[PDB]
Design a protein around this ligand. Structure first.
Ligand code: TA1
Ligand code: GTP
Ligand code: GDP
Ligand code: MG
Lengths: 436, 290, 187, 158, 428
């Protein structure tokens, strides 16, 4: 009834999907072998996994997801890993050859011949859904697959549905830490196609989350799995209101109505709190006010943006666990009296709050600890234009010399794509400015 | 009349969630995930089952009393006497028993292979159909029987797709429908032969839509009454006797006792000057509505 | 097998170029031999099978019996060299009714004779390399007046040199074919 | 004798007394979107299933390894004034007495639903009777000749 | 006679309706099974105002439960008092409201009203003398506002003579749980003014204070707030249900409170309200109940009476008392605070009285007041609306349902016209 379709493209997408589809199968008691035991059943009950699974004719729960990739090697690790009895092999789509960090190879040459089977898999998976809340894309801007595929995918998806809503969770090239040399090119190229097609698009980067895991959890040895775990926790806290009960339920339709005032402006920040180890939680009480201050702290964001250089066009809070509405109403009042946080004049309101009674779960062997509360903060603030201007600068600093342009012009592209994406980014920055 | 596409999901939810009512027990053997194609069973639906009653449970006829009495008990050594001693109905036939409806239809198999130009259209305000091509230029001879053969389905989204398929093709059909009638009788009869209320209440509304979809369909259907009315004769008198209780359920179409009366009136309406006798021959309780 | 897969424009079952082309094929030789050699006309590898007693040296598409090759694409195309010898091949078909027909084409035969389960027909091969296309859905309609559903088994007998076996789903032209799915005979 | 279950208005918990300190840790009950005002609670002989009456009239039986809920209550109806005085007969069945005088016997053995095999039935009712007034207390007396004699104190002081 | 049908729109409206039907079901002493187990005959004399008979001596409520996203309707069905509703008095749709008043009132509302009207007609005809309607809105969400008004407009053009109530919960002036909330408020008001006869306005913020100061509740959940809305909603009708030395039908409350057709936004309050400690010391007399009700705190709306004057008010007592006391109490209050009333209205309070009190209490009362203080509430919203509409924020959603801009401009002007009328009769 309330189901989502979760795509994971590229490597980062299907890496974070490992954590996501481990967290879900653990939160709902599903064993790695498709089926949950007979004990966890509660008489007659559904819609607890319907959102993230489809029950087969007998026993197995197959996840309603897709793992698309052009590098065979990660889909093979998934096929051989412990979570292989879960996925029916026809879900994990692979390819003999990768894009090799070329947006052209992703969007014009190689993905053009596998979008057809991707769309057929999506057809077969979305007809199975009675009430489709939406597609959740897990792109990874900065790689060849991600950049070209997610773009071509969204073009086809919008020409098919259009009215249906697409939410994306993209990683963005961090300004300081960057593991590519041409990635400004593909970021600029992906944005022009995604803005016009996707309907909401969160943004996050590895730098902020490294910092978060350093500050709070105090881990001197972070790896990509630590970032994946936090992304999975954020998404679980988000899709709670769809798959659970509690005061002030939240559905994607309303959530996107009351956070995107203008068609263009939909990029938004993210934040999660509390995020601590076991010893820390042992010396704490974790009031709702403490958690909301932690959430609204700019250092706890998952994107290298400063909100105090902009205002808040709106925001959104999704609590979890033991919460009551008076506490949230008192915390928002304190925050709106505060002065460091700005709000644009034309939104005297601006806090969509949701609650639910299902506490957050901890994955054994993970990094977080058990808590009775949690808050995920999502805000559409006009300050994010700085991480767009960074890449706007970088694109032309490289395009002036026209380095690496030969790859793109030989792989079925020309020069005009760069200029059109440049103009689009300039227009986007002008639009962001216009709202002051 | 009213559509059949929307009503079904809300009805199933109201029945299973709101009341403590049962699905009840829709067999999903051979069908796994949404990706793996099912293994079609060789059985057939609406099939009369053989008599299972034992050998001996059949009473024997006593020539002396003119009565069927059960045979006496053979002795047993464990049950021996001790010191102290001072002291047939026939096996009913499954007339109203829901036949077994396996998922081995042809619509499911064709949809699995992906040969159908249909898809679900979630972008609408509700569940709608979305055609890959233009309906009014399809080959009805090939597609329309396939869509009727999916009415018997109960697993989602097959039954929704099948009902919505016929519902939309009958609107734009027109003259293209009349020559297809001889091929629609078998799936209609098979859907009715299941004795299941859900499929029966659906196919009766589709049959109404069928006679209304075009002209001259009535006379053309008339020769085929001998193969579709035999079930009408059963549930013609399945009604609810509420007395003073107003029937809120009238909002949707669930009462067969009048879903059949409306359809028979419609048949007599369209069949011409001789449909009444062909009806009265199969269902004797019928009364001319002209 | 090949069920719940994706067949939309092409489906290549055999290709001489690869680490192991007879992945799914079973091979039975009695007085013959199978190998992969570099052809001269089409300067690439071709998998050749030869030997006496055509009816005994062959390769079946499904690895073993009791396992079907579920494939629903109408057109079937082979790329074969004509060695001017006895060559034949057979394809089994499932009709709309649950009956398994089978058609075979032989170059040592001169008359077609429809039968309840079999349809033998001659084949007029050209000289050297040539691609042969079977409608495989007009054939069932023309022979038994029924409809094509899906192929079940394919089998190719001796005295031929195979390069490509693929289902096409429609008659593509020499232009529309990709580079791998065509005959590029060099100088 | 180290764990104990307690029920109330909109809450059920199982508390275990820790050995290292003077603390006792609770574990809450997880029931699917059910809000029931539990009144009486009984535990079987082997700590398998906790039975709990309800003002609605249900007799919820839950497992106790994990405290989640299993079966709703008496089929073929529902107790009139809510379940008030509940007790267990050693044979594994439950005596239930509502707030109207309905005293009945529910045999609680996990049964499969006849029509839908992977589903359970509700608790049937072996015997039933009517006494004068709301039932408030039940105690047992093992006669063992035919059955058991239960002393039943009703709100009407009978 | 005087039977009344009850509607519940939106999630909140469906939730407070779960209490209103739970409180009343205990008043007349029926069970969650729907069977009657009271003791007196007054439980049965006018039971037909709220229930229809059922087979086997059961009573089911004359209620309608309308809301998209049937997830909420599983909740109320699963509550301890869900088993009394007829499971076919449930109209719903799988698609969401999304807090977009447009789709709740243009696209997905038009798909259900034809079914709802079928249901309300069915049990409008189940009443011998149907008194009127009453709903439960939430002017923030899209279901309550969007569907409610569209439904109401339909009823008005079908049952003009009858009377329509509305227990609409207004948005909060300080608190805004949603963001497009002022859009949903103003657009609904453009419908209510011409398509209603009495419209109580209630705000959860004042419900939090009342639970905080008076009731001394630590953690007021939404149940307690709903527990208060339930309390008053029962207090309005005890005349229709129970004997009374001066009974007050709803139509005579109307004519005594709305001198002009448009000034039909009321202000409500309940009494007695004490904690468990104060209950031991306070004594229950007419004086206590009238000073507490005439206080500016018991007003469950976010409006200050002292910033206005009561055009008219009305108090309803239930509990065996003396009519003389309540007759002079409303006199004294009318004398002292002569600035808090008007001059062209000689006596501007009506003091009804009932003979049967609440279940466990012995004296109780309910305050209803048509003051010009409410004009503050509409003033506030008319800014938050004109704030974002000046910037056309979030408006693209509303154009997405065939709407236009004229609809807003007309809607806003309707309130500015309205609040202007509340000033004319407030000569300060
Ligand atoms: C010993 C004693 O008298 O206890 C009282 C009591 O102390 C007080 C504090 C009660 C109590 O109310 C509360 O504690 C409360 C909590 C949250 C929100 C509102 C109330 C009481 O629950 C409320 C209850 O009152 C009723 O039953 C009313 O008739 C009321 N009933 C309900 O709302 C109700 C409905 C279903 C199930 C349970 C209660 C009512 C009011 C209007 C119309 C019909 C019914 C009674 C007498 C008491 C308790 C139990 C403590 C009060 O409530 C009412 C409405 O009577 C709170 O202020 C009053 C003053 C009472 O003195
Ligand atoms: N947060 C997080 N980021 C990751 C993870 N794995 C990879 N990334 C980042 O993803 C980006 C590269 O994405 P890829 O998917 O490998 O590139 P691609 O889109 O597949 O393009 P090709 O390499 O040509 O196939 C790099 O910036 C990685 O740091 C992960 O597990 N967690
Ligand atoms: N008294 C009370 N008010 C509520 C409750 N839940 C929500 N409200 C308010 O009702 C408004 C939301 O309306 P809602 O019905 O959920 O959205 P809709 O479906 O689009 O109409 C919000 O202002 C909520 O704060 C509740 O449980 N009790
Ligand atoms: Mg990559």
């Amino acid at each position: 009834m309330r189901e989502v379709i979760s795509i994971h493209i590229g490597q980062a997408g299907i890496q974070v999907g490992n954590a996501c589809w481990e967290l879900y199968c653990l939160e709902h008691g599903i064993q790695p072998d498709g089926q949950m035991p007979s004990d966890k059943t509660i008489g007659g009950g559904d819609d607890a996994f319907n959102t993230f699974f489809s029950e087969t004719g007998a026993g197995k729960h197959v996840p309603r997801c897709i793992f698309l990739d052009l590098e065979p090697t990660v889909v093979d690790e998934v096929r051989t890993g412990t979570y292989r009895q879960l996925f029916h092999p026809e879900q994990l789509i692979s390819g003999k050859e990768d894009a090799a960090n070329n947006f052209a190879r992703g969007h014009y040459t190689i993905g053009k011949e596998i979008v057809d089977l991707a769309l057929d898999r999506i057809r077969k998976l979305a007809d199975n859904c009675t009430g489709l809340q939406g597609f959740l894309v897990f792109n990874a801007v900065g790689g060849g697959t991600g950049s070209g595929l997610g773009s071509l995918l969204l073009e086809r998806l919008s020409v098919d549905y259009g009215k249906k809503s697409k939410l994306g969770f993209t990683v963005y090239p961090s300004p300081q830490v960057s593991t590519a040399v041409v990635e400004p090119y593909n970021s600029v190229l992906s944005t022009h196609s995604l803005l016009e097609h996707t309907d909401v698009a969160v943004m996050l980067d590895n730098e902020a989350i490294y910092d978060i895991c350093r500050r709070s959890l105090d881990i001197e040895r972070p790896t990509y799995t630590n970032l994946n775990r936090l992304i999975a926790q954020v998404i679980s806290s988000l899709t709670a209101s769809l798959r659970f009960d509690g005061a002030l339920n939240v559905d994607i339709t309303e959530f996107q109505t009351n956070l995107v005032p203008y068609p263009r402006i939909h990029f938004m920040l993210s934040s999660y709190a509390p995020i601590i180890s076991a010893e820390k939680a042992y010396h704490e009480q974790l009031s709702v006010a403490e958690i909301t201050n932690a959430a609204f702290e700019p250092a706890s964001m998952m994107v290298k943006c400063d909100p105090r250089h902009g205002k808040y066009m709106a925001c959104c809070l999704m609590y979890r666990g033991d919460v009551v509405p008076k506490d949230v109403n008192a915390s928002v009042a304190t925050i709106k009296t505060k002065r460091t946080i700005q709000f644009v004049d034309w939104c005297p309101t601006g806090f969509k709050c949701g609650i639910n009674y299902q506490p957050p779960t901890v994955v054994p062997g993970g990094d977080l600890a058990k808590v009775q509360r949690a808050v995920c903060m999502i805000s559409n603030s006009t300050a994010i234009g700085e991480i767009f201007s960074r890449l706007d600068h970088k694109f032309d600093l490289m395009y002036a010399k026209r380095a690496f342009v030969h790859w793109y012009v030989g792989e079925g592209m020309e020069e005009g794509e760069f200029s059109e994406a440049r103009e689009d980014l300039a227009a986007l920055e002008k639009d962001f400015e216009e709202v002051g | 009349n009213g559509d059949v596409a929307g009503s079904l999901f809300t009805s199933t939810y109201r029945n299973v969630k709101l009341a403590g009512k049962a699905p009840p027990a829709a067999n999903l053997s051979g069908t796994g995930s949404c990706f793996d194609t099912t293994s079609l069973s060789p059985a057939r639906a609406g099939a009369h089952k053989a008599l299972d009653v034992q050998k001996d449970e059949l009473p024997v006829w006593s020539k002396s009393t003119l009565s069927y009495k059960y045979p006496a008990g053979r002795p047993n050594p464990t049950g021996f006497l001790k010191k102290g001693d001072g002291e047939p109905s026939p096996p009913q036939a499954g007339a109203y028993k829901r036949r077994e409806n396996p998922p081995n239809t042809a619509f499911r198999r064709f949809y699995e292979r992906g040969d159908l130009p249909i898809a679900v259209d979630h972008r609408g305000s509700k569940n709608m159909i979305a055609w890959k091509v233009d309906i009014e230029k399809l080959d009805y001879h090939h597609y329309l029987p396939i869509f009727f053969d999916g009415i018997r389905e109960t697993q989602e989204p097959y039954r929704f797709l099948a009902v919505k398929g016929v519902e939309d093709m009958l609107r734009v059909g027109g003259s293209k429908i009349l020559p297809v009638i001889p091929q629609l009788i078998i799936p209609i009869k098979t859907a009715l032969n299941t004795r299941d209320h859900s499929v029966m209440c659906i196919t009766l509304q589709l049959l109404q839509k069928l006679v209304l979809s075009a002209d001259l369909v009535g006379e053309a259907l008339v020769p085929y009454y001998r193969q579709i009315l035999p079930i009408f004769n059963l549930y013609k008198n399945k009604n609810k006797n509420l007395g003073d209780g107003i029937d809120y359920g009238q909002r949707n179409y669930d009462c067969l006792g009048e879903l059949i009366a409306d359809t028979l009136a419609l048949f007599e309406q369209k069949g011409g000057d001789d449909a009444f006798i062909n009806i009265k021959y199969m269902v004797p309780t019928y009364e001319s509505s002209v | 097998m090949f069920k719940n897969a994706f067949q939309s424009g092409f489906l290549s079952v055999l290709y001489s170029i690869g680490s192991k082309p007879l992945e799914i094929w079973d091979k039975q030789v009695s007085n013959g031999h199978i190998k992969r050699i570099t052809d001269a006309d089409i300067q690439s590898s071709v998998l050749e099978i030869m030997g006496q007693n055509v009816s005994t040296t062959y390769i079946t598409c499904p690895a073993d019996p009791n396992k079907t090759l579920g494939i629903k694409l109408p057109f079937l195309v082979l790329i074969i060299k004509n060695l001017n010898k006895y060559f034949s091949f057979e394809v089994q078909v499932l009709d709309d009714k649950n009956v398994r027909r089978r058609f075979r084409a032989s170059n040592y035969q001169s008359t077609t004779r429809v039968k309840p389960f079999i349809c033998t027909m001659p084949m007029r091969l050209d000289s050297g390399w040539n691609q042969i296309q079977f409608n495989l859905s007009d054939f069932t309609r023309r022979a038994y007046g029924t409809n094509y559903i899906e192929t079940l088994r394919v089998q190719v007998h001796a005295n031929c040199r195979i390069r490509r076996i693929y289902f096409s789903d429609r008659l593509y032209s020499e232009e529309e074919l990709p580079a791998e799915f065509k005959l590029f005979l060099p100088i | 004798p180290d764990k104990l279950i307690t029920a109330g208005n909109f809450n059920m918990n199982v508390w275990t007394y820790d050995a290292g300190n003077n603390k006792l840790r609770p574990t809450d009950a997880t029931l699917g979107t059910l809000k029931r005002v539990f009144k009486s609670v009984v535990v079987d002989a082997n700590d398998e299933y906790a039975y709990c009456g309800t003002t609605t009239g249900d007799v919820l039986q839950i497992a106790l390894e994990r405290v989640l809920f299993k079966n709703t209550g008496p089929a073929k109806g529902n107790v009139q004034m809510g379940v008030t005085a509940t007790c267990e007969v050693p044979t594994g069945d439950i005596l239930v007495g509502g707030g109207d005088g309905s005293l009945q016997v529910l045999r609680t053995v996990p049964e499969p639903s006849s029509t839908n095999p992977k589903l359970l039935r509700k608790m049937p009712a072996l015997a039933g009777t009517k006494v004068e007034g709301a039932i408030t207390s039940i105690a047992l007396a093992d006669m063992n000749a035919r059955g058991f004699t239960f002393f039943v104190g009703t709100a009407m002081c009978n | 006679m005087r039977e009344i049908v009850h509607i519940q729109g939106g999630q909140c409206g469906n939730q407070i309706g779960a209490k209103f039907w739970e409180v009343v079901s205990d008043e007349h002493g029926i069970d969650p099974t729907g069977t009657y187990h009271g003791d007196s005959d007054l439980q049965l004399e006018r039971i037909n105002v709220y229930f229809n008979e059922a087979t086997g001596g059961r009573y089911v409520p004359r209620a309608i439960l309308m809301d998209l996203e049937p997830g909420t309707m599983d909740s109320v069905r699963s509550g301890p008092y869900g088993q009394i509703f007829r499971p076919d008095n449930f109209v719903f749709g799988q698609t969401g409201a999304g807090n977009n008043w447009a789709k709740g009132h243009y696209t997905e509302g038009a798909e259900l009203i034809d079914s709802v009207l079928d249901v309300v007609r069915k049990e409008a005809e189940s009443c011998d003398c149907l008194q009127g309607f009453q709903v439960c809105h939430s002017l923030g969400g899209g279901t309550g506002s969007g569907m409610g008004t569209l439904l109401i407009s339909k009823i008005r053009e079908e049952y003009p003579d009858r009377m329509m109530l509305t227990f609409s919960v207004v948005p909060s002036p300080k608190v805004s749980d949603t963001v497009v909330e002022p859009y949903n408020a103003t657009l609904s008001v453009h419908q209510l003014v011409e398509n209603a006869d009495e419209c109580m306005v209630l705000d959860n913020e004042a419900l939090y204070d009342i639970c905080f100061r008076t009731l001394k509740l630590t953690t007021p959940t939404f149940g307690d707030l709903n527990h208060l809305i339930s309390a008053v909603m029962s207090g309005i009708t005890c005349c229709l249900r129970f004997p009374g030395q001066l009974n007050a039908d709803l139509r005579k409350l109307a004519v005594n409170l709305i001198p002009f057709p448009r000034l039909h936004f009321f202000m409500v309050g309940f009494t007695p309200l004490t904690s468990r400690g104060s209950q031991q010391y306070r004594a229950l007399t007419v004086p206590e109940l009238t000073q507490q009700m005439w206080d500016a705190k018991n007003m469950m709306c976010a409006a200050d009476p002292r910033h206005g004057r009561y055009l008219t008010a009305s108090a309803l007592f239930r509990g065996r008392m003396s009519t003389k006391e309540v007759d002079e109490q409303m006199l004294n209050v009318q004398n002292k605070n002569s600035s808090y009333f008007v001059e062209w209205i000689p006596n501007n309070v009506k003091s009804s009285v009932c003979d049967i009190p609440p279940k466990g209490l012995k004296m109780s009362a309910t305050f209803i007041g048509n003051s010009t203080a409410i004009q503050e509430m509409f003033k506030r919203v008319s800014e938050q609306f004109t704030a974002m509409f000046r910037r056309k924020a979030f408006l693209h959603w509303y154009t997405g349902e065939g709407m236009d801009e004229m609809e807003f401009t007309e809607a806003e002007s309707n309130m500015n016209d309205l609040v202007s009328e509340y000033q004319q009769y407030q000569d300060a």
